[PDB]
Structure 1
Amino acid sequence: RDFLQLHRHDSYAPPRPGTLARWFVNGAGYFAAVADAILRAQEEIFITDWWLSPEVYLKRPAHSDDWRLDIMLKRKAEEGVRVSILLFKEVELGINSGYSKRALMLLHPNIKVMRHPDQVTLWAHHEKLLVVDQVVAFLGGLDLAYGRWDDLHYRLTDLGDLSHNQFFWLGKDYSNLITKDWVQLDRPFEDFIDRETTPRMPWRDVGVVVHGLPARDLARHFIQRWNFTKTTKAKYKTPTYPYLLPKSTSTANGGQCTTVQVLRSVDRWSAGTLENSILNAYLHTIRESQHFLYIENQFFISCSDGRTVLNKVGDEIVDRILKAHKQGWCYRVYVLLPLLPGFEGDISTGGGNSIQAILHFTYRTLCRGEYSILHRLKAAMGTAWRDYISICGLRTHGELGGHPVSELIYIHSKVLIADDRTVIIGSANINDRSLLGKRDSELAVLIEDTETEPSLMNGAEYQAGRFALSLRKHCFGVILGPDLDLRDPICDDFFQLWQDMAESNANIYEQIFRCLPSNATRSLRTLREYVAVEPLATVSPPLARSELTQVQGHLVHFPLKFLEDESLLPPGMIPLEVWT
């Protein structure tokens, strides 16, 4: 299909039936599959990254220079493969795109990198995509950068000439972004925190690969952004940066048979056109959802008021729940977020300007204010909102220094699942920045199933989508920890079992680690005293390990009353459009 008309959900790309698509949870399998795709490139490699760390390894542990990203791209580039890279140009943030760009272009003359934007702006290029030969395309929330690689283990420690090393995260890759963000990126293989003292912050993300027609659709988005970026500065207008051109479309002859539609967010500054098709697909999929929603997003800033926050994703969830409550349907909404926003800050003393600013708009979407989701549900159903919505986070524990350590599993995913039939994997967070189209540039794909599996829906027979059901059962089985029945996702037996574990796990982590955030600190004056108490994990480690045997999975309830007596807004100069 062509690109003269806008398509479903006002998307530049039409739905591509018969697409072979495969999902990836955590950066382990994603970076490994990316390495396999890079290795078999014959003509072109298209890369967009909000942050690209060149020395990252796509496979672990690192024994050699093989599987290192900048080495692999250098090995394809001089077989004749044209590597075109678009990197977000920061406002020196500390991602240091200048070092990434100069290092990438130093590898081979067949590797060309353009940085955008050059002008001062609050918005960014956020989409993560790698396309090989316009036939294989990777996208999601995973940037080829430090701290993203992780697996089901969610290791908190990395203790054990690359010949005999056994570290999974080398140097700048061993990180805990809340404790301290990156510095000195021109020294990749050196540490910037203490592995013996400070644990890792696990990284949960969801990626996806598509084959065939959607990949050319995604390659056309890159080609549009590329040739448009060629027009943005005099250095890029030279023939040094070649015009990229699409590979005409019916030259299109382990993942599943799907229907995939490519959606994106673009504006005049990011590309030559406007599109908010991710937002459209988000509103529509919520509205047509018949049974449940599984949301796993880094941010959750929604609920329109016309002035501060404009996207109506949260307003679509309240309307969908309020209707299921009036008809008497069985309808669940699972929302999983990182317990803390992703910024450096001392949570022992309140978190900081940036974290509290995000928390303000997080809780405003959830529980605090007239526009919040829960306050509007309680206005129509009272305390029965606990039956329709469940907002949780993740947290795991390990050992370090001879005593148990704990840390939240930073949920960087940007995924939505509806009715075990429809999936949305992309870079778009639930906020105005990623969704409105006018701000950050984003990508997403809508994966609707065609082949179905026998399943259960509230105790009833239900042919569920093969691609979507398998993704949710992977998410549920990991956050819930062998004897569990995960077929039915909306029944009272599972939903009660779900909430019981989210609260019990939340309790145990609070008794043993006294972790933050927590419902036990509703003010800053109370928080000052809560942190002056040493937790049981370090007082009596044998006792702590005893109680930790009762934790099942990583699911912990999201603390709604955490610092609920505080402003959470900064006194400050920064436009509030930055956090919305």
Structure 2
Amino acid sequence: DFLQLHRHDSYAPPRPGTLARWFVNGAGYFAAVADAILRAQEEIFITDWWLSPEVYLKRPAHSDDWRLDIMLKRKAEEGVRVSILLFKEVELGINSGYSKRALMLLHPNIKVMRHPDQVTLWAHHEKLLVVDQVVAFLGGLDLAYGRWDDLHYRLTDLGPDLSHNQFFWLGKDYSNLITKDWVQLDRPFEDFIDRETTPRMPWRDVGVVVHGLPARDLARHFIQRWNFTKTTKAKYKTPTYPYLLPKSPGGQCTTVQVLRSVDRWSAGTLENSILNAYLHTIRESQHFLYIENQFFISCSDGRTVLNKVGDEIVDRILKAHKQGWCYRVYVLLPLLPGFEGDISTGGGNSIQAILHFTYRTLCRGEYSILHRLKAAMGTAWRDYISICGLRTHGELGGHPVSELIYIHSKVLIADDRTVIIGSANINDRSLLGKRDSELAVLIEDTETEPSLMNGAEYQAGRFALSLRKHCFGVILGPDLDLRDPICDDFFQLWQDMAESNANIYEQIFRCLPSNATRSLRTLREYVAVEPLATVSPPLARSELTQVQGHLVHFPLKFLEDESLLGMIPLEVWT
């Protein structure tokens, strides 16, 4: 199975008959992770870009039960060997030193290695937990603060002996990473933003659990990285860090293939099979793509942006337009990048740098998707691609408040039949292989159910259709017909709701980003106006009843008059 590369040049072959189950949001994912830890008998393997030891896997907490570090300590006390690989930041505020020391203190059977020790731009980004080399969790969710959430996407959490606790996010877990970055992680149960005045930011993400052969394949990636990391410095070469060896509930039978991005620096071998699977899946798609991703930085110029995901999307749309076939691309992006900054004053240079490359993919310049579509078909591009974000509202301090829903997912769905779930963002950092290390699974359905595709009967895949309908249903908010994802009536309904919700949120909250602020000049005057939410809470509440779902148009004109791009290498942002 591992003497030679496979489909998409992956180290692992496709695995038919694999039981797999998807998760939307951290609540179900973290609870299933907890259940799997509890039943571990031999080994637990964990990779994290950030691991918060005191995070709770089930909420709300009333004791030390379900706290990550306590759960791992008890399993280690039972004889389970826990092996953990953490990213070593440049003291970023993730504080891997605190995580390492806390985990190593728990029990002698828990071993942690950090990497890299050299200065580099790139990171270990994959999120993985494997139990007994037979059950594997992956996706966009780190076992970290701020990640737990559910369909309620709560903006508030108002209700150390925890017996009477009612909070869902204790201490550092209550957070809004755009308002303020994490500080003082060695004080896990102390707030660092004002619960009474400062809404948290909802976190949307996608995970998956796979059983059997793909879980063993994922264990083999962990083992390869573990044994490679042993050789990186003298402390890790000793038997204190043992050589690891491959061991030769709602799940759907599928065909699953593991994919990864790794390089010499990260694993001692080269692979970019996530990128390969993305390009092949887009090229071979026949009806639609649904893309929910934290980043959308693509369209190659051969110099500053290299990955061709955006280029394959353009070619696929142009091909469908040339042949006269119905084809839709849904892109769901976070309305603002997840960096600390004040968007009312422009957002700061980190936010603006990401915004620059985001709009470069979307609609600004010769390489953008919309410029190349407009060139071939003019205004008809709106028939083939819709770019949206998510927003919600609640109440705090006696008046409505609003916040974007942070899309941290890294998922693609094609044709209601194929799904890619992993850690890889759509940017060069995740996809080129040479930069950040990443994991993903390509999930192809072999079992189907009768559905619709532009009005015709269509055998859709069970795993993909259930996931796609769950995304659409949450995003759109009973009598909605979600069977057909590309027919004219539904696509119009999608665009109408995205525009209607965006207009209402702008009328009530004057929230940013917005097409109303195309320069920093106009932004300065725009934010000096008090929004209706606080001027007249009753009038604001009445208008907010017309919102349905969370879908909002992604404003394509925000700060379009500014350049948005000093000595940091540009590849930091791509």
Report the TM-score when normalising by structure 2. Answer: 0.99
Match of 1:290 in 2: 286
Query: In the TM superposition, what whole-angstrom CA distance separates every residue of 1:381-410 from its partner, at most 9, and x where no partner exists?
Result: 100000000000000000000000000000
The answer to whether the 8 A contact 1:331-1:490 is kept is yes
Displacement of 1:226 in angstroms is: 0.1
SS in 2 for 1:269: helix
CA contact (8 A) 1:339 1:558 kept: yes
Partner-residue secondary structure (3-state), 1:48 = strand
Residue number in structure 2 paired with 1:29: 28
> Per-residue CA shift, 1:155-195, capped at 9, x if unaligned?
00000010001000000000000000100000000000001
Q: What per-residue deviation string (whole Å, max 9, x for no partner) do you get for residues 220-262 of structure 1?
A: 0000000000000100001000000000xxxx99210000000
SS at match of 1:494: helix
1: CA distance, partners of 2:342 / 2:493: 34
Q: Report the Cα distance in structure 2 between the residues aligned to 1:474 and 1:14, rounded to whole angstroms.
A: 29
Q: Answer whether contact 1:212 1:253 (CA < 8 A) is retained.
A: no
SS of residue matched to 1:102: helix
3-state secondary structure, aligned to 1:319: helix
| Preserved contact between residue 290 and residue 419 of structure 1 (Cα < 8 Å) | yes
How has the CA–CA distance of structure 1 residues 489 and 237 changed in structure 2, closer, same or farther, with 3 Å as cutoff?
same
Please say if residues 85 and 114 of structure 1, whose CA atoms lie closer than 8 Å, have aligned partners that are also in contact: yes
Given the alignment of the two structures, is residue 207 of structure 1 paired with residue 203 of structure 2, yes or no?
no
Specify the alignment match of 2:183 in structure 1: 183
**Tell me, what secondary structure is at the counterpart of 2:478?**
coil
Q: Is the 8 A contact 1:292 1:418 kept in 2?
A: yes
**Alpha-carbon distance between aligned partners in 1 of 2:287 and 2:344, rounded to the nearest angstrom:** 40
Identity in percent: 100
Q: Aligned to 1:445, what secondary structure does the other structure show? A: strand
**Aligned counterparts of 2:488 and 2:398: Cα–Cα separation in 1:** 41
Tell me the distance in 1 between the aligned counterparts of 2:359 and 2:344: 19
Residues 543-565 of structure 1, C-alpha deviation per residue, up to 9 Å, x if partnerless? 00000000000000001000000
Measure, in 2, the Cα distance between the counterparts of 1:289 and 1:508: 35
2:254 is the counterpart of 1:258: yes
The separation in 1 between residues aligned to 2:54 and 2:269, in whole angstroms, is 34
Per-residue CA deviations over 1:510-551 (Å, capped at 9, x if unaligned) read 000000000000000100010000000001000000000000
Q: 1:253 to 1:530 in 2, by over 3 A?
A: closer
- Counterpart CA distance in 2 for 1:92 and 1:561 is 36
Shift of 1:304: 0.4
Residues 316-353 of structure 1, C-alpha deviation per residue, up to 9 Å, x if partnerless?
A: 00000000000001000000000000000000100001
User: What does residue 506 of structure 2 align with?
Assistant: 510
Matched residues in 1 for 2:498 and 2:312: separation?
25
3-state SS of the aligned residue for 2:403?
strand
Q: The residue matched to 1:130 in structure 2 has which SS?
A: strand
CA distance in 1, matches of 2:536, 2:120: 51
Q: 2:540 aligns with which of 544, 562, 577?
A: 544
Per the TM alignment, residue 272 of structure 1 is displaced from its structure 2 partner at its CA by: 1.1
Q: How far apart in 2 are the matches of 1:472 and 1:539?
A: 39
For residue 298 of structure 1, report the CA deviation from its aligned partner.
0.1
How many residues are aligned here? 573
The answer to whether the 8 A contact 1:427-1:444 is kept is yes
Give deviations 1:21-58, integer Å, cap 9, x for gaps.
00000000000000000000000000000000000000
> What is the DSSP-based 3-state SS (H/G/I as helix, E as strand, rest coil) of the residue aligned with 1:566?
coil
What is the CA–CA distance in structure 1 between the aligned matches of 2:335 and 2:180, rounded to whole Å? 17
Q: CA deviation at 1:504?
A: 0.3
Contact 1:299–1:430 under 8 Å retained in 2: yes
Q: Distance in 1 between matches of 2:414 and 2:377?
A: 23
Match of 1:82 in 2: 81
CA shift digits 1:480-522 (9 cap, x unpaired): 0011000000000000000000000000000000000000000
Q: Residues 348-367 of structure 1 correspond to what in structure 2 (within 5 A)? A: 348-367=344-363
* Structure 2: distance between partners of 1:75 and 1:573: 48
Q: Aligned equivalents of 1:61 and 1:79: distance in 2?
A: 26
- C-alpha distance in 1, partners of 2:281/2:374? 24
**Aligned partners of 1:314 and 1:101: how far apart in 2?**
38
Matched residue of 1:153: which SS? coil
Distance 1:75 1:554 in 2: 41
SS at structure 2 position matched to 1:293: strand
Q: Name structure 1 gaps, 5 residues minimum.
A: none
Q: How much does 1:453 deviate?
A: 0.5
* CA–CA separation in structure 1 for the residues paired with 2:549 and 2:170: 27
3-state SS of 1:183 partner = coil
CA contact (8 A) 1:357 1:568 kept: yes
Matched-pair contact (CA < 8 Å) for 1:131–1:137: yes
Deviation at 1:573, TM superposition (A): 1.2
Contact kept? 1:451, 1:465, Cα under 8 Å: yes
Distance (Å, rounded) in 2 between the aligned partners of 1:156 and 1:393: 17
Q: Secondary structure at the match of 2:467?
A: helix
- 1:408-431 Cα offsets, whole Å, 9 max, x none, are 000000000000000000000000
Q: Secondary structure in 2 aligned to 1:394?
A: strand
**Per the alignment, do residues 126 and 137 of structure 1 end up closer, same or farther by CA in structure 2, a change over 3 Å counting?**
same
Q: What 5-or-longer segments of structure 2 have no aligned partner?
A: none
2:244 maps to what in 1? 244
Q: 1:304·1:371 contact (CA, 8 Å) conserved in 2?
A: yes
Corresponding residue for 1:63?
62
Q: Give me the whole-angstrom Cα distance separating, in 2, the residues matched to 1:416 and 1:403.
A: 37
2: distance between equivalents of 1:518 and 1:483?
30
Q: Deviations over 1:85-121 (max 9, x none)?
A: 0000000100000000000001001000000000000
Mapped to 1, the partners of 2:500 and 2:76 lie a distance apart of: 52
Q: How far apart, CA to CA, are the structure 2 residues paired with 1:477 and 1:195?
A: 30
TM-score where L is the length of structure 1: 0.98
Matched, 1:425 2:424: no
Per-residue CA deviation, residues 118-147 of structure 1 (Å, 9 max, x unaligned), is 000000000000000000000000000000
Deviations 1:255-305 (A, max 9, x none): 100000000000000001000000000000000000000000000000000
Kept in 2: contact 1:47–1:85 (CA 8 A): yes
User: 1:447-499 CA distances to partner (integer Å, 9 max, x unpaired)?
Assistant: 00000000000000000000000000000000000110000000000000000
Distance in 2 (alpha carbons) for counterparts of 1:3 and 1:146: 36
The correspondence for 2:296, drawn from 296, 300, 311, is 300
Residue 522 (structure 2) aligned to one of 503, 514, 526: 526
Are the structure 2 counterparts of residues 276 and 74 from structure 1 closer, same or farther at C-alpha, using a change threshold of 3 Å? same
Counterpart Cα distance in 1 of 2:467 and 2:249? 27
Measure, in 1, the Cα distance between the counterparts of 2:557 and 2:489: 27
Which residue is 1:13 aligned to? 12
What residue in structure 2 maps to residue 375 of structure 1?
371
Q: Is this contact kept in 2: 1:270–1:441, CA < 8 A? A: yes
Q: Which residue in 2 is equivalent to 1:221?
A: 221
Q: Per the alignment, in what secondary structure is the counterpart of residue 180 of structure 2? A: coil
- For 1:253 and 1:514, the matched residues in 2 are separated by 44
Report the secondary structure of 1:484's partner residue: coil
Residue 63 of structure 1 contacts residue 163 of structure 1 at CA under 8 Å; is this kept in 2? yes
Other structure's SS at 1:66 match: coil
| Counterparts of 1:375 and 1:77, CA distance in 2 | 56
Distance, in Å, in 2 between the alignment partners of 1:73 and 1:455 is 43
